[PDB]
Every structure is written in C-alpha cells, then in structure tokens.
Scaffold this active site. Structure first.
Site, PDB file in Angstrom:
ATOM      1  N   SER A 116       4.318 -95.050  69.773  1.00 13.90           N
ATOM      2  CA  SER A 116       3.398 -94.147  69.100  1.00 13.90           C
ATOM      3  C   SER A 116       2.968 -92.954  69.960  1.00 13.90           C
ATOM      4  CB  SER A 116       2.224 -95.016  68.579  1.00 13.90           C
ATOM      5  OG  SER A 116       0.946 -94.481  68.718  1.00 13.90           O
ATOM      6  N   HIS A 117       1.710 -92.502  70.054  1.00 15.96           N
ATOM      7  CA  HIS A 117       1.226 -91.402  70.877  1.00 15.96           C
ATOM      8  C   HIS A 117       1.339 -91.643  72.375  1.00 15.96           C
ATOM      9  CE1 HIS A 117      -2.038 -94.226  71.083  1.00 15.96           C
ATOM     10  NE2 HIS A 117      -2.396 -93.525  72.138  1.00 15.96           N
ATOM     11  N   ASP A 287       1.828 -86.981  65.481  1.00 19.20           N
ATOM     12  CA  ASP A 287       2.112 -87.808  66.623  1.00 19.20           C
ATOM     13  C   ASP A 287       3.580 -88.211  66.767  1.00 19.20           C
ATOM     14  OD1 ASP A 287       1.321 -91.242  65.820  1.00 19.20           O
ATOM     15  OD2 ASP A 287       2.063 -89.806  64.433  1.00 19.20           O
ATOM     16  N   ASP A 289       5.578 -90.738  66.317  1.00 23.22           N
ATOM     17  CA  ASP A 289       6.317 -91.367  65.208  1.00 23.22           C
ATOM     18  C   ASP A 289       5.999 -90.870  63.765  1.00 23.22           C
ATOM     19  OD1 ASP A 289       4.534 -94.554  64.713  1.00 23.22           O
ATOM     20  OD2 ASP A 289       3.784 -92.915  65.815  1.00 23.22           O
ATOM     21  N   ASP A 291       3.129 -90.744  61.875  1.00 21.35           N
ATOM     22  CA  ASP A 291       2.233 -91.393  60.926  1.00 21.35           C
ATOM     23  C   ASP A 291       0.739 -91.035  61.047  1.00 21.35           C
ATOM     24  OD1 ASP A 291       1.433 -93.586  62.998  1.00 21.35           O
ATOM     25  OD2 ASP A 291       1.335 -94.878  61.292  1.00 21.35           O
ATOM     26  N   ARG A 292       0.459 -90.116  61.978  1.00 13.13           N
ATOM     27  CA  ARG A 292      -0.902 -89.642  62.195  1.00 13.13           C
ATOM     28  C   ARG A 292      -0.939 -88.108  62.137  1.00 13.13           C
ATOM     29  NH1 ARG A 292      -3.329 -90.355  66.657  1.00 13.13           N
ATOM     30  NH2 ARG A 292      -2.310 -91.797  67.994  1.00 13.13           N
ATOM     31  N   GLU A 375      -8.383 -93.241  58.045  1.00 14.05           N
ATOM     32  CA  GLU A 375      -9.031 -93.759  59.248  1.00 14.05           C
ATOM     33  C   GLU A 375      -9.577 -92.595  60.060  1.00 14.05           C
ATOM     34  OE1 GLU A 375      -6.891 -97.954  60.558  1.00 14.05           O
ATOM     35  OE2 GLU A 375      -5.777 -96.166  61.003  1.00 14.05           O
ATOM     36  N   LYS A 388       1.350 -95.430  57.658  1.00 11.21           N
ATOM     37  CA  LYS A 388       0.653 -94.169  57.396  1.00 11.21           C
ATOM     38  C   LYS A 388       1.673 -93.028  57.341  1.00 11.21           C
ATOM     39  CE  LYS A 388      -2.038 -94.566  60.896  1.00 11.21           C
ATOM     40  NZ  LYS A 388      -1.283 -95.186  61.980  1.00 11.21           N
TER      41      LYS A 388
END
Length: 561
Positions: A116-117, A287, A289, A291-292, A375, A388
C-alpha cells in the site's frame, strides 16, 4: 515443464494481517524460501479437487521485486495443480482492478503484490495480500489458516524451469510432467476490464464534454509513480480527452520515485503547491495501489475525506449506477466525521457506524446493505467491487461537477448550508510509552462511565459542551458474527461534537495515539471559517480531560490531517 518438490524449513513470523503479509523487501530476498513458503501456504488453502478448474488473478502496485515474486507465484501455482492464472500486463494490476477481474471472470481469488502507501525499492517494503472469490481480502478464518500452514510447512512443490513473459498479451500454455490438462497463463491488458466496468457505472459522454468541451475543467491528477498511472492515461486522457499534461507522475516506477505514495497534504505536497496558483479547477492524488484518494479544489482547497463521502452521497443520483441500482445503505468507520450522518438522516436510508478497516464494509455490501462508504483516512468506495477505489471517487467527483456546473468550493459551501458543517481534524501522536497511555485510557474510561459524567457541562468560548454519551466503542458484526471490542475511546457531546481517542499500541515498538476531533456547527456565519480556530476549544478540552501532556509528556502531534 518439470514438477519438483523442495523440502523446506518453516518460519515463525509469517502472520498475515487484514492487509496480507507485509514485510520489508530485505526479508523476502534474503530469508531462504520466505516467499516460496508463504505462496505455497496460500495455494494450499485451496482444496485439491477444486484446483484444476480454479483460476487465480495475480498482479500488484509495481514496486521493486514484484516481478520476481510473480514468476514465483506462477511456478508454484503450476506445480501445485492450479489450472489457470490471469496476470495483468507486465504484472501490473491495481487493487480495485484485481477485485473487478476476480468478480468478472468468477476467479477463486487473487494474489495481490502490494504494501500500500508503504514505500518500495531495495530498502523498501513488500507485501503479499490474498483476496478471495467475492473479490475482497481474505477473512480471519482464512488468514489464520494460511498462518498455521506457514508455521508447520515441511515442503513445497515447484516447476523450476518454467518462465512466462509478462509483456506479451494473450494466452500461454505449458505441459507439466505426466499431468493430462496443460497449464494456462493469460496475459490480460491492465486497464481494459476495469475501464469496461467504469464505462457502465459512469456517464463517459458527460465526462468527455466536461474535460474536452469549450468549458473545459482543467484538472490535475497525480498518480505518485504507482499502479494507477496507466489507468489515468488510458481512461482520463485517451478515452475522456483530458490533455496529456493533466496526468502527473503516471509511469509505474519500482521505488515510487524514491517517495512515499501517500495521498495526504504532507506527501502530495508538489500537487498541493501546484493547485495553489489558481489555473486548475480540480486536483487529486492516489496511493501506491489506487484504493485511497485525496480531492483538491481550486487554489489548494482541501476537500476533507469525511466531507467528500458526504458530498458524493448528497448528490449520489447524478451517477448512472445509483440511478439504476438504488442506494441501499451508507457507512463510515467511527473516527470519521458526522457529515455523512447529516446527509443519511435527511433520508429513510440506513447509516452504519463501524470499526476501522474494510471487513466491516465488505460484509454489509455482501448482505446488500451498503452502497456508499467512506473513511477519514482518504478512503472512499461503493458496492461495484469489494475493495476501496481511488479513481472511482475521482470519476464520481467529476460526475458531480458535470451535473452541478459549480466549482468544488461552491459545492461544499452549499453542502455546509444545507447540512451544517462538521469541522474535523486528526492528530497523529506517533509512538509513546505504553504505561502512561494505558493509564490515560483506563482513567478516562472510569471517568467517562460515572453517574455524573453524562449530562455534565464541559465548556469554553461561544458554546457549551454537554456530555450526552461516553464509551469505549464496540461493534457486533451483523453478518459474520464477530464482536470487535474496545475499538476506541469516545466522548460525545449534545450539540453533535465528538472526541475519539485511539491507541494503536505495538508489542514490538511502542503505542501510537490517534486523536480525532469532530465538531458540529450549524450557524450560517461560523460555518465558513478556519478549522483549527473552531476546533481549538474541543482540542484543549481533549488534552485537559485526557491529561496527555501529563501521562505521556507530549506537547504537539507528529502529523495533523
């Protein structure tokens, strides 16, 4: 291709969390058979009779070592009985893209290579997230089963000699010693199925008029050198017509160009200064991947992740998918603002306050009880996939700009005049000494549960803060039956304001304190002013009741969001 069996020796620390096994690159390339062991343990939760007919999807954010591990997944999956593997072109597949293909082609699950991040490169991080057939992350019963197997594994099966080409589209078949059916590796384009999904969700015609037509919304999208870059170029630039120069940092680099791919004001600073000048009307960062997301209006106007889910919900019918599908439930995690609740209450559509992390969201969505969710940690999603989706939030935002014809700032002022404003901020007090923290939590709990705690007047400056409720938040999942206890400490006042305390304690490094302040303001005059000014009364009440400067000695926070 030959099938070999390698006698290995198990590892003690391979416990996969809700976000798969995340471990720095060094462990994976230096600890002999660490990756192999985890991959053979993942393949092993798949039952023998179901393997030949099973298709697994594979792909990741693009960071360093992703290609070596994919060639490992292929070889072990092959020797193990897996019939088919659909790999994204070059191994590149985003996290919302992998959820989308699993569901589309009815795959058994997918293996996603992402941390992820968390940074990437040789001195970076590396993860192996397992997703199941509904397209979402594996649930605890499956993550722990992987865990028990990785701990007692003696040997793993591999096809050493096999090596697929990842840049070539199409189908590749191989023959494995004495096995009657051959092994199929299918290289799929990375953006195609995902953009075909988005095509039926959104009105690409209106978006093409927005981005290309005489009015032309001048946007700026920074993909921070991660997995979503390919997708921006192909969907927003080639298909929707946005200028080539609209897509910043859109070439997947293994080290994410030596920077953290985290969509926040601190890390997407280059985009924030670029937005300040005034020439663009919309900006967004994503980010590693995809999803944010971070939404930015004109001149740098930060659209807070809590306000954003509420704006999209207040206009949700502007999106074709919602018009045809209906909105069957709203949701947010507990530390996220009450802005989404002000919108949900205006309708006979149900709202759900849940703990942190997707599992809570996922289960409601599978129970046909959730359409839109958000979120405060830059996360937005809907029931189209089971993860997400950063770019989906961007197209939902451009869909609301297209319909409305107002600027982002105007959409929010209107929003706050209809629904009032929930001023929100978040103080990240990274890692403290555990004893002081637990004291502060137990003290607070005791004090919060008193016969005279409730109803009492706490105050400062213009208003009065009367404690309507105060607890340590727990959740009873309506779908899988689990009860997540003591999720966070929260003081809830009568006007609607809240203060949430969350202790991310690590039995390895320390204990992080996350302070969340949500303050509801309904007055027409006070609504448009600065958040830190309006939040200071409730932040000092939070330090005066928690005794943070006292029990942990901290003055200021590591990060503010």
């Amino acid at each position: 291709v030959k099938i070999v069996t390698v006698k290995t020796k198990a590892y003690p620390d391979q416990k996969p969390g809700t976000s798969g096994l995340r471990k720095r690159v060094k462990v994976f390339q230096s600890s002999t058979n660490y990756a192999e062991n985890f991959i053979q343990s993942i393949i092993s939760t798949v039952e023998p009779a179901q393997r030949q007919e099973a298709t697994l999807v594979v792909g990741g954010d693009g960071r360093f070592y992703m290609k070596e591990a994919i060639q490992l997944i292929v070889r072990i999956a092959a020797a193990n009985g897996i019939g088919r593997l659909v790999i994204g072109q070059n191994g590149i597949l985003s996290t919302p893209a992998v959820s989308c293909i699993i569901r589309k082609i009815k795959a058994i699950g997918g293996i996603i290579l992402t941390a992820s991040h968390n940074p990437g490169g040789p001195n970076g991080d590396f993860g192996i997230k397992f997703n199941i057939s509904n397209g979402g992350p594996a649930p605890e019963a499956i993550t722990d089963k992987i865990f028990q197997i990785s701990k007692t594994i003696e040997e793993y099966a591999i096809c050493p000699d096999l090596k697929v080409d990842l840049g070539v589209l199409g189908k590749q078949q191989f023959d494995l010693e004495n096995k009657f059916k051959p092994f199929t590796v299918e290289i799929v384009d990375s953006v195609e199925a995902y953009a075909t999904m988005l095509r039926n969700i959104f009105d690409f015609n209106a978006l093409k008029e927005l981005l290309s037509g005489p009015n032309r919304l001048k946007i700026r999208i920074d993909a921070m050198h991660g997995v979503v870059g390919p997708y921006v170029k192909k969907i927003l630039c080639e298909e929707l017509g946005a200028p080539a120069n609209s897509a910043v940092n859109c070439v997947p680099l293994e080290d994410f160009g030596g920077h953290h791919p985290d969509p926040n004001l601190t890390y997407a600073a280059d985009l924030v200064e670029t937005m300040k000048s005034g020439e663009h009307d919309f900006g967004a960062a994503f980010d590693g991947d995809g999803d944010r997301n971070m939404i930015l209006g004109k001149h740098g106007f930060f659209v807070n992740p809590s306000d954003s889910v509420a704006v999209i919900a207040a206009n949700i019918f502007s999106i074709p998918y919602f018009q045809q599908t209906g909105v069957r439930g709203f949701a947010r995690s507990m530390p996220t603002s009450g802005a989404l609740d002000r919108v949900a209450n205006a309708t006979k559509i149900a709202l759900y306050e849940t703990p942190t992390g997707w599992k809570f969201f996922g289960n409601l969505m599978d129970a046909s009880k959730l359409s839109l969710c958000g979120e405060e940690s830059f996360g937005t999603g809907s029931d189209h996939i089971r993860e997400k989706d950063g770019l989906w939030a961007v197209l939902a935002w451009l869909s609301i700009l297209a319909t409305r014809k107002q600027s982002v700032e105007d959409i929010l002022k209107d929003h706050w005049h209809k629904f009032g404003r929930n001023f929100f901020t978040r103080y990240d007090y990274e890692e403290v000494e555990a004893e002081g923290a637990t004291k502060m939590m137990k003290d607070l709990e005791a004090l919060m549960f008193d016969r005279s705690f409730v109803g009492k007047q706490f105050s400062a400056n213009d208003k009065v803060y009367t404690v309507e409720k105060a607890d340590n938040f727990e959740y009873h999942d309506p779908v899988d039956g689990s009860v997540s206890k003591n999720q966070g400490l929260r003081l809830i006042f009568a006007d609607g304001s809240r203060i949430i305390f969350r202790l991310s304690g690590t039995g390895s490094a320390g204990a992080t304190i996350r302070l969340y302040i949500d303050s509801y303001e309904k007055d027409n005059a006070k609504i448009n002013q600065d958040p830190q000014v309006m939040l200071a009364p409730l932040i000092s009440i939070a330090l005066k009741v928690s005794q943070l400067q006292e029990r942990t000695g901290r003055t200021a926070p590591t990060v503010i969001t």
